[PDB]
Amino acid sequence: FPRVKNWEVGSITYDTLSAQAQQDGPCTPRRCLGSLVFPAPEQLLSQARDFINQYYSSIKRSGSQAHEQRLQEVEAEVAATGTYQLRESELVFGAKQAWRNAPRCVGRIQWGKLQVFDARDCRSAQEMFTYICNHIKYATNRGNLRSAITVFPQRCPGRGDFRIWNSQLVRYAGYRQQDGSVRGDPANVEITELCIQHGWTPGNGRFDVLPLLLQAPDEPPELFLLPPELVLEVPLEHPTLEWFAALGLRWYALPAVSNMLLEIGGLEFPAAPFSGWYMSTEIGTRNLCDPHRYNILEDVAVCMDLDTRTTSSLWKDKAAVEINVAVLHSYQLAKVTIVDHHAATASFMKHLENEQKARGGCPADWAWIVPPISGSLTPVFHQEMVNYFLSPAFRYQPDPW
Amino acid sequence: KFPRVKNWEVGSITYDTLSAQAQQDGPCTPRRCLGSLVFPAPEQLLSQARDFINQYYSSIKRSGSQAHEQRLQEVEAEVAATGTYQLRESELVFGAKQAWRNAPRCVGRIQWGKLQVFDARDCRSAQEMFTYICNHIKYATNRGNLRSAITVFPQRCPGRGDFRIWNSQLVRYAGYRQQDGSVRGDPANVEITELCIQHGWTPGNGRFDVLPLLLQAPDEPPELFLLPPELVLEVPLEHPTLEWFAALGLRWYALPAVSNMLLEIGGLEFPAAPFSGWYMSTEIGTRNLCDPHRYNILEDVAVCMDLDTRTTSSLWKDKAAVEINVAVLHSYQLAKVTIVDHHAATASFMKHLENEQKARGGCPADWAWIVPPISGSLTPVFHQEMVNYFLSPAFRYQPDPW
Ligand code: HEM
Ligand code: HEM
Ligand SMILES: CNCc1cc(C#N)cc(OCc2ccc3c(C)cc(N)nc3c2)c1
Ligand SMILES: CNCc1cc(C#N)cc(OCc2ccc3c(C)cc(N)nc3c2)c1
Ligand SMILES: CNCc1cc(C#N)cc(OCc2ccc3c(C)cc(N)nc3c2)c1
Ligand SMILES: CNCc1cc(C#N)cc(OCc2ccc3c(C)cc(N)nc3c2)c1
Ligand SMILES: [Cl-]
Ligand SMILES: [Cl-]
Ligand SMILES: [Gd]
Ligand SMILES: [Gd]
Ligand SMILES: [Zn+2]
Ligand SMILES: [Zn+2]
Ligand SMILES: [Zn+2]
């Protein structure tokens, strides 16, 4: 059992939960790859079983009357049609567990408070879109953001899946140019490439909210326009640097990742958008300052009058920090939920403490838990971590096109 | 089987073939990753030796005829009459550079070619030891124009005790225990400060009192030695615009010189082989000055900046840390003492990875330690995928001789 130590505290735990890691990671004793971004009836049955026992154990029905009944209900259902159906409650449990087991998420102390939308009765593209709109609106809540997931029908033998061709529900457009540059978010060119050619008249703004590409089974994907009152945005200003507002920057309220596949007791859900609220550094450092994102660092450095000719002026660091201050301030001023990296990591340490008492440990990925700036300043930096894979889980899947 | 690794800024993909020669084992399995953990005989002595010789002869291209199979059979034979063998001085230099070349956690390996290897294998006592060390410091400091160096004292061998340096670094500041629970000076060094005194040292009462050296000869107790004050180049810390900074009274030494690691070459072990480079500002700026249990001047600096330290979302911690790093960088350049910032350090490491990929088909790198402790994603190494593993020759950790 792994001996993990908090070097700022000198305290020790043993990760006993790691011993149950359902799958295998990419590391071996020969070489570690923990920095890599992307590492059948009896099969479905054994996964189904392991999950249903995990549910009844969680609710303390270990060996109960109602316990042995559901087991053979699944045994029957799977025996009859290979695949099987999740009870509503089993599905809510699945959604929370998957969030909870996500090793790269720093906001897991909120895992028990998640709202699950059951859209498993969905039938078409138009019906998907409505369900999404109710999601975006429930979850935005006029700025007071709330965590939620919307699950669509599980996968079925010999048939096209429901998919969301958008990586997030709200993504800005990315337009190529005559001089090969890019207008907008360049991470989203591949999907603007599509939406435009899927029947969408394109803008030219740096911050054009993309339409939703939604796909029903077999009868191919179908475009959808978002109502602009559904999509809450924050204009970005800085608390003492009056010129920052004039850069014309903004970001959206709602981090809503869609293109991941949810897996619960052997059932795979190709479409299941989940959303929380933003950590400041994701907007400040990754979205605005990354070289192949919006890449504003230098522009801001120039306006602060910093020496951009020499790395030793640390202009990059100085600019980056004030870009993060602008983000927080802008969100607070607009009363839209936001968390800074110090508050985030501090709550995560509390989470490790919780998980230690509750489950014997916690799957955490150090390289993603540590924030993109001021790493050593946060308390997760000097905390040793163990990464592994549990079920239920969120997985990646091939780009649906 | 080849580990496919990608640079996510550029989009470039390489295959780390070198990882296949992974000598040791790490703490990771497919069950779980432990990559964030800080700390994880004639027959096989000969197998280690053989592999080492085959590296060294392949180095100078001429490999597989001359004194190669000669040296092998010579080494294979030298183990027979004795057990332990001895390196050709050119083999020592080669292995010395290799051990730097191989260290997965050092962002400064662009320079591994230019290292000055001092052969102190004929060293005989604690006093000659001290003399080699003063010379090391003298050459490496070079009035502020720093040069990479390493001095190799005699290998561990049966029937003799070890040469050992008890200090973790050649230059370190003392750390006294006050009555009020606080520590005057560097808290990291309370232990070694305890020992120095118990072994006769008459201590100081300053926050930057340079420590003596405790030097150990085989089967002999460690002897105490004061570095001559004019041998230790120190830098006063001041901020290029914040004039009140200078009244914090801070300084750091010029030369990072780690003295407590084991050097392993071709099965042979050099428990005493101190090596030094030059600082990267973040080590001094963030780690030594801002860490809670190091010198811990962050809140203190923040208040003087009239930042709002009552709330995390003001980012007072980040703001104060950046100016502390600016002070370090500016002070070192003022003093004409060699230093390097994390943007420069990392950009060169990216070039190193390009060299190493062409040279050896890979490069052992520990992501969590290469990525600077502030502004991670502002540097190119953040978005570069890496493969961590153990190759020999190597610098290794070893027990405190007490
Ligand atoms: C409510 C507050 C939340 C916060 C503050 C938060 C924060 C974060 C952050 C900072 C990351 C790192 C992302 C990166 O570096 O790319 C992350 C990843 C992740 N989070 Fe959370 N998140 C929240 C809600 C949620 C919810 C509601 C779910 C699922 C139901 C979730 C599951 C995940 C997953 C699966 C990842 C890994 C995704 C990937 O790396 O592709 N989180 N989160
Ligand atoms: C010349 C300029 C050099 C720079 C800028 C540099 C920089 C660094 C840094 C920043 C670290 C990480 C330390 C930490 O985060 O605590 C490191 C680790 C390391 N470096 Fe250096 N270094 C230099 C020279 C050298 C030389 C000459 C050697 C050996 C001959 C060396 C060997 C090592 C080793 C073995 C480690 C890992 C030690 C450990 O993990 O405990 N470096 N280096
Ligand atoms: C650029 N990094 C690689 C990357 C690629 C993709 C893809 N394709 C998705 C990624 O998900 C990060 C993520 C996911 C969900 C989040 C939620 C719910 C809340 C929150 N605050 N932050 C979140 C961050 C990250
Ligand atoms: C947005 N998709 C394209 C893209 C663009 C840019 C740019 N410019 C950078 C990207 O890096 C993804 C990435 C790669 C490695 C990471 C590691 C080791 C750790 C970590 N915490 N996050 C990481 C994120 C991806
Ligand atoms: C807190 N870190 C744990 C730690 C433990 C041990 C042990 N045992 C050794 C460590 O050496 C880091 C190091 C080593 C050599 C360096 C050289 C030559 C130059 C330079 N600029 N920085 C360096 C940093 C760090
Ligand atoms: C007790 N020794 C002194 C000491 C003091 C403090 C304090 N305050 C912190 C210490 O941990 C260093 C450490 C721990 C984990 C690290 C990880 C995962 C990655 C990385 N790049 N560097 C790391 C450095 C050590
Ligand atoms: Cl995002
Ligand atoms: Cl140091
Ligand atoms: Gd101006
Ligand atoms: Gd001033
Ligand atoms: Zn690993
Ligand atoms: Zn990034
Ligand atoms: Zn530290």
Taking residue A183's Cβ as centre, other Cβ atoms within 10 Å add up to 19
Peptide bond into B393 cis (omega under 30): yes
Q: How was this structure determined?
A: X-ray
Cited resolution, angstroms: 2.2
Helical (H) or strand (E) element with A364: none
- Nearest CB to B28 within list A7, A27, A340: A27
Crossing angle (nearest 10°) for helices A88-100 and A41-58:
90
Q: Residue A191's closest CA among A207, A213, A206, A216?
A: A213
Cα gap A74→A64, rounded to integer Å: 16
Contact B377, A286 (CB under 8 A): yes
Q: Which of A100, A108, A163, A171 is catalytic?
A: A108
SS3 A223: strand
**What DSSP state is assigned to residue A204?**
-
* Residue A282 labelled as part of a binding site: yes
Name B315's Cβ contacts closer than 8 Å, sequence gap at least 6. A321, A324, A325, A328, A340, A342, A374
The dihedral of CA A9, A11, A17, A19: what is its sign? positive
Which of A33, A340, A375 is opposite residue B315, by nearest beta carbon? A340
Distance from the CA of B60 to the center of ligand 4, in angstroms?
Answer: 39
Cβ distance B31 to A15 less than 8 Å, yes or no, reads no
* DSSP at A277: -
Structure tokens belonging to residue A51:
């999950």
- Cα distances from A19 to residues A53, A370, A389, in angstroms, run 17, 24, 10
Q: Taking CB atoms and a 6 Å cutoff, what residues make up the pocket around ligand 6?
A: A 7-8, 366, 382; B 36, 38, 188, 291-293, 368-369
DSSP H helices, A59-124, are 65-81, 88-100
Pairing of strands B222-225, B149-152: unpaired
Element (H, E) at A39: none
Give helix B42-59 / helix B89-102 axis angle, nearest 10°. Answer: 90
Residue B177 to residue B205: CA distance in whole angstroms: 10
**Residues A211/A224, Cβ–Cβ less than 8 Å:** yes
Where do the DSSP E strands lie in A197-336?
212-215, 222-224, 233-235, 250-252, 256-257, 261-264, 267-269, 274-275
Is the CA virtual torsion B250, B253, B257, B259 positive or negative? negative
Reference A222, options A132, A158, A116, A119; nearest CA is: A132
How much is the CA Rg of chain A, to the nearest whole Å? 23
Query: Residue B210's beta-bridge partner residues?
Result: B173
Chain A residue with minimal CA distance to B290? A377
Which residue among B19, B312, B347 sits closest to A31, beta carbon to beta carbon? B19
Reported as half-sphere exposure (CB side, CA atoms, 13 A), residue B299 has a value of 8
DSSP conformation class of A26: S
Q: Do B271 and B255 meet the contact criterion of CB atoms below 8 Å apart? A: no
CA A269 vs CA A90, A99, A163, A264, B60: distances in Å: 14, 14, 9, 8, 58
Contact B253, B232 (CB under 8 A): yes
Alpha helices in A83-156 (DSSP H): 88-100, 125-140
Give backbone dihedrals phi and psi of A11, rounded to 5 degrees, phi first. -90, 155
In ligand 3, the atom with minimum distance to the C-alpha of A286 is: 1
Q: In what order do the strands lie in the sheet with A393-395?
A: A267-269, A261-264, A393-395
Does the distance separating the beta carbons of B314 and A376 come in below 8 Å? no
Beta carbons of A86 and A92 less than 8 angstroms apart:
no
Q: Is B107 exposed, middle or buried (0-12, 13-18, 19+ CB in 10 A)?
A: buried
List of residues 6+ apart from A282 with CB closer than 8 A? A255, A372
Give the closest residue to B133 by CA, choosing from B258, B254, B220. Answer: B258
Q: What are phi and psi of A191, to 5 degrees?
A: -105, -20
Task: Dig out the tokens for A139 from the structure.
Answer: 């979850």
- Count the residues in chain B: 402
> Is B207 one of the catalytic residues?
no
Task: Report which of A176, B389, B192, A80 is spatially closest to residue B209, judged by C-alpha positions.
Answer: B192
* B378 inside 8 A of chain A by CB: yes
Q: How many CA atoms lie within 13 A of A248 on its CB side?
A: 4
Does the Cβ of B148 fall within 6 Å of ligand 5? no
Interatomic CA distance for residues B260 and B169, integer angstroms: 7
Q: Nearest CA to B117 among B141, B148, B159? A: B148
Cβ A195 vs Cβ A172: under 8 Å: no
Q: Report residue A319 CA to chain centroid gap.
A: 27
Residue B339 C-beta-side C-alpha neighbours within 13 Å: 28
B109 in active site: yes
- Ligand 6, from A35, A382, A384, A385: best to mutate by most atoms within 8 Å of Cβ? A382
Nearest to B263 by CA among B38, B30, B87: B87
Distance separating alpha carbons of residues A8 and A91, to the nearest angstrom: 39
Cα–Cα distance, B393 to B390 (Å, whole number): 9
- Which residues from B are below 8 Å from A366, CB to CB? 35-36, 368
Which residue segments constitute the domains of chain A, with CATH numbers given?
15-120+147-157+261-275+345-369 (3.90.340.10), 121-146+161-232+396-400 (3.90.440.10), 233-255+278-343 (3.90.1230.10)
Q: Rounded to an integer, what distance in angstroms lies between the CA atom of residue A109 and that of residue B292?
A: 25
SS3 assignment, position A394: strand
* Whether the Cβ atoms of residue A385 and residue A365 lie closer than 8 Å to each other: yes
CB of B356 closer than 8 Å to CB of B363:
yes
Select from B269, B254, B8, B279 the least CA-distant residue to B144.
B254
How far apart CA B125 and CA A272 sit, in angstroms, is: 71
Give chain B as a 3 state SS string. CCCEEEECCCCCEEECCHHHHCCCCCCCCCCCECCCCCCCCHHHHHHHHHHHHHHHHHHCCCCCCCHHHHHHHHHHHHHHHCCCCCCCHHHHHHHHHHHHHHCCCCCCHHHCCCCEEEECCCCCCHHHHHHHHHHHHHHHHHHHCCCCEEEECCCCCCCCCCCEECCCECCCECEEECCCCCEEECHHHHHHHHHHHHCCCCCCCCCCCECCEEEECCCCCEEEECCCHHHCCEEECCCCCCCCHHHHCCEEECCCEECCCEEEECCEEECCCCEECCCEHHHHHHHHHHCCCCCCCHHHHHHHCCCCCCCHHHCHHHHHHHHHHHHHHHHHHHCCCCCECHHHHHHHHHHHHHHHHHHCCCCCCCHHHHCCCCCHHHCCCCCECCCECCCCCEEECCCCCC
Radius of gyration of chain B measured on its C-alpha atoms: 23
Residues B124-151 as b/e (b if ≥16 CB within 10 A, e otherwise) read eebeebbebbbebbeebbeebebbbbbb
d(CA B329, CA B281): 6
What's the CA gap between B296 and B282, in Å, rounded?
14
Nearest residue CA, atom 6 of ligand 6? A8
- Return the residues preceding each gap in chain A, C–N over 2.5 A, or none: 39
Amino acid in position A77: E
Can you spell out the DSSP letters for A3-21?
A: EEEETTTTEEEE--GGGG-
Instruction: Look up A105 and say whether it is catalytic.
Output: yes
Q: Report the relative pairing of strands A222-224 and A212-215 from DSSP bridges.
A: antiparallel
- Ligand 4 binding pocket, CB closer than 6 Å: A 35, 37, 187, 290-293, 367-368; B 8-9, 383
Query: What CA–CA distance (Å, rounded) separates B154 from B156?
Result: 7
Task: Find the residues whose C-beta lies inside 6 A of ligand 3.
Answer: A 167, 255, 257, 259, 274-276, 278-279, 282
Joined together, the tokens standing for residue B225 give 């030695």
Give the SS3 label for residue A168.
Answer: strand
CB of B373 less than 8 A from some CB of A: yes
Q: Find the helix or strand (DSSP H, E) in which A319 lies.
A: helix A315-333
Give the residues across from B214 on adjacent strands: B224
Instruction: State CA B340 to chain mean position distance.
Output: 15
Per-residue burial over A270-303, b = 16 or more CB atoms within 10 Å of its CB, e = otherwise: bbbbbbbbbbbbbbbbbbbbbeeebebbeebbeb
Nearest to A44 by CA among A266, A269, A268: A266
For residue A87, what are the contacts with CB-CB under 8 A and spacing of at least 6? A70
Give the whole-angstrom CA distance, residue B237 versus residue A326.
Answer: 30
For residue A6, what are the β-bridge partners? A11, A383
Per-residue burial over B189-207, b if 16 or more Cβ lie within 10 Å, else e, is beebbebbeeeebeebeeb
Contacts with A307 (C-beta within 8 Å, 6 or more apart), sequence order:
A313, A315
Indicate the top mutation candidate among A104, A285, A290, A297 to test ligand 4's pocket, ranked by most ligand atoms within 8 A of CB: A290
Terminal-residue alpha carbon distance, chain B: 44
With contact defined as beta carbons under 8 Å apart, do B104 and A31 qualify? no
Cα(A168) to centroid(ligand 3), Å: 9
Tell which residues of chain B come right before a gap with C–N over 2.5 A.
40
Amino acid at A209: V
Which residue is it, tokens 């300053």?
B206
Output the CA angle A226-A229-A233, nearest 5 degrees: 95
